[PDB]
Amino acid sequence: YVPPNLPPDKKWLGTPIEEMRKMPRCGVRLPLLRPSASHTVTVRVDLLRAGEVPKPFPTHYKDLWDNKHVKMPCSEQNLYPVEDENGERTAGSRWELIQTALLNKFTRPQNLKDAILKYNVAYSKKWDFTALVDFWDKVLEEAEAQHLYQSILPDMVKIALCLPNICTQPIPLLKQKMNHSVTMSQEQIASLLANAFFCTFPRRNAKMKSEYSSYPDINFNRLFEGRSSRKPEKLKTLFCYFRRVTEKKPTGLVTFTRQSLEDFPEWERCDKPLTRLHVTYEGTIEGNGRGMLQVDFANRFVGGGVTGAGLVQEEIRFLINPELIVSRLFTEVLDHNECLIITGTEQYSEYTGYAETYRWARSHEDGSEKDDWQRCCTEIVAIDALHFRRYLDQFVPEKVRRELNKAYCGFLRPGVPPENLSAVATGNWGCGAFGGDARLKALIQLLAAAAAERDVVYFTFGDSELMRDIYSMHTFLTERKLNVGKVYRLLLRYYREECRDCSSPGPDTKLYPFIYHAAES
Numbered sequence: 001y002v003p004p005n006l007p008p009d010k011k012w013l014g015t016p017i018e019e020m021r022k023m024p025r026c027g028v029r030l031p032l033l034r035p036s037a038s039h040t041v042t043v044r045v046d047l048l049r050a051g052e053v054p055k056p057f058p059t060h061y062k063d064l065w066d067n068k069h070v071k072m073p074c075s076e077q078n079l080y081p082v083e084d085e086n087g088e089r090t091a092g093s094r095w096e097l098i099q100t101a102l103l104n105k106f107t108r109p110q111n112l113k114d115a116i117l118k119y120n121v122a123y124s125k126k127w128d129f130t131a132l133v134d135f136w137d138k139v140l141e142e143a144e145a146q147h148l149y150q151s152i153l154p155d156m157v158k159i160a161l162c163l164p165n166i167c168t169q170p171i172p173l174l175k176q177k178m179n180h181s182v183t184m185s186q187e188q189i190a191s192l193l194a195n196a197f198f199c200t201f202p203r204r205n206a207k208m209k210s211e212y213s214s215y216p217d218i219n220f221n222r223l224f225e226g227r228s229s230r231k232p233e234k235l236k237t238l239f240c241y242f243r244r245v246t247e248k249k250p251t252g253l254v255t256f257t258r259q260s261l262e263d264f265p266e267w268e269r270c271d272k273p274l275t276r277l278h279v280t281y282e283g284t285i286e287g288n289g290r291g292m293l294q295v296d297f298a299n300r301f302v303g304g305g306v307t308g309a310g311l312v313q314e315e316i317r318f319l320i321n322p323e324l325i326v327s328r329l330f331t332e333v334l335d336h337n338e339c340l341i342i343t344g345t346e347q348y349s350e351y352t353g354y355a356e357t358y359r360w361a362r363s364h365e366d367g368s369e370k371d372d373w374q375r376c377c378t379e380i381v382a383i384d385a386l387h388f389r390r391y392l393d394q395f396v397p398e399k400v401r402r403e404l405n406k407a408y409c410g411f412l413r414p415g416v417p418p419e420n421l422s423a424v425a426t427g428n429w430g431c432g433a434f435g436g437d438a439r440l441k442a443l444i445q446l447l448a449a450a451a452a453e454r455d456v457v458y459f460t461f462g463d464s465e466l467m468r469d470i471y472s473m474h475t476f477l478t479e480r481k482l483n484v485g486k487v488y489r490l491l492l493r494y495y496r497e498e499c500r501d502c503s504s505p506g507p508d509t510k511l512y513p514f515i516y517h518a519a520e521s
């Protein structure tokens with residue numbers, strides 16, 4: 001069986017995009033946003049009104065310095081040792097120290113550094129600031145850099161130091177196995193990120209295995225190091241944010257939910273049928289999946305290398321929607337059965353390129369209308385694929401079972417009637433830096449979505465052959481009436497037969513050919 005040749009000029013195939021369900025239009029009436037055992041809410045829900053920056057709850061700063069919550073910098077327990085009159089050691093408030101370090105003009109880059117390091121003295125002789133020093137003096141002109149130091153940086157310091165009156169409620173850590181949600185103000189997030197920018201957060205820098213060894217970086221220290229060329233475009237994009245939220249205090253709310261599923265489908269038996277597909281080689285997930293569930297091609301440590309190294313799908317999403325970065329403050333690494341769902345973040349910048357082609361394009365005025373909880377109508381899910389080192393590895397059932405489960409966990413929304421759930425807006429998940437095969441993930445995903453009762457929208461990101469092969473396969477499986485079960489079974493029939501005992505680094509027969517042949521020929 002060789003697949004039927006399809007319309008050679010057309011840009012998309014399958015169900016027309018504008019027929020897929022999308023929020024807010026498809027959404028269930030959200031209930032009274034109340035705090036609960038599983039939902040921390042850090043603003044005044046009674047006072048919550050369109051256009052008005054939310055008042056934080058409770059009104060005055062309550063601190064928790066422990067292993068259940070973020071260790072806020074401004075805590076009275078954030079200490080450093082100090083010699084007294086006699087030489088005997090006492091503790092000094094690190095917060096005060098920070099305050100009086102950052103309340104100074106920064107008229108050169110050397111100053112900002114001096115500042116950050118005044119509290120981070122252990123890393124005086126470990127933290128490179130080239131990238132910054134370069135950005136300020138060489139990449140930004142007299143005009144731009146003047147606006148940065150008498151305006152933006154001081155504005156950032158203001159919201160940074162207002163933290164205790166902004167994030168008055170303790171932020172719990174979203175640990176492994178917790179099914180928990182946090183919802184906080186865009187304003188609150190900007191304060192924390194401002195703090196992140198000034199490398200303010202305590203106990204989050206150990207090379208040595210610490211308490212937070214299990215969590216991603218959050219201080220921005222690494223954005224300052226290296227002779228890397230993409231650092232500046234990164235800075236341009238984050239300042240675009242810091243400039244937008246200092247000038248006009250944002251009035252939205254944002255929700256982070258960790259999801260852990262303990263019980264999965266018995267895929268061999270799964271009776272549910274395939275869902276509707278729309279696949280296109282133009283568009284992008286952020287660009288075109290307006291209203292749908294947009295996937296983040298995530299690292300287990302969420303956000304990937306946004307604070308320093310990387311600059312691919314996730315890092316990019318996290319830069320254009322910087323409010324996602326704060327997820328790193330409190331989200332432990334993802335186990336194989338976990339994900340992070342962020343409803344509410346805004347897009348502040350537009351871009352061009354990818355990896356080392358990345359340029360900051362312009363500011364973006366996010367268009368998304370807000371929901372019942374004053375959260376933008378855009379829901380990202382971060383799911384982490386496996387980073388396959390040898391290409392065949394991924395067809396081992398265990399590897400397929402897993403990628404299936406992750407995808408599932410990221411899509412499934414327990415309790416929710418399918419007819420309310422939007423489409424999933426995805427693409428070549430795990431088939432870039434993580435080096436997996438697109439044709440397989442495509443299927444896997446398409447199977448998981450099926451199991452989740454969510455229709456898919458796949459962006460092939462330029463690859464039009466993929467658009468066809470994808471589509472061809474979807475339509476072949478569908479007209480031949482196949483459920484998730486059989487389609488899974490065949491994937492293992494593929495392993496046993498071409499992969500299990502394979503001399504070469506690649507099989508003689510690719511997946512789709514094999515599947516086509518193995519069902520109806």
Ligand SMILES: Nc1ncnc2c1ncn2[C@@H]1O[C@H](COP(=O)(O)OP(=O)(O)OC[C@H]2NC[C@H](O)[C@@H]2O)[C@@H](O)[C@H]1O
Nearest residue numbers: 284285297298299304312313427428430431432433434
């Ligand atoms: N905006 C957008 N829309 C749709 N498709 C995209 C987009 N950007 C990239 N892609 C496609 O998806 C592929 C995957 O991007 P990538 O970030 O390389 O996804 P992976 O899961 O393979 O990489 C994961 C790791 N990299 C960054 C994260 O920290 C992960 O640790 C990429 O090569 C493209 O073909």
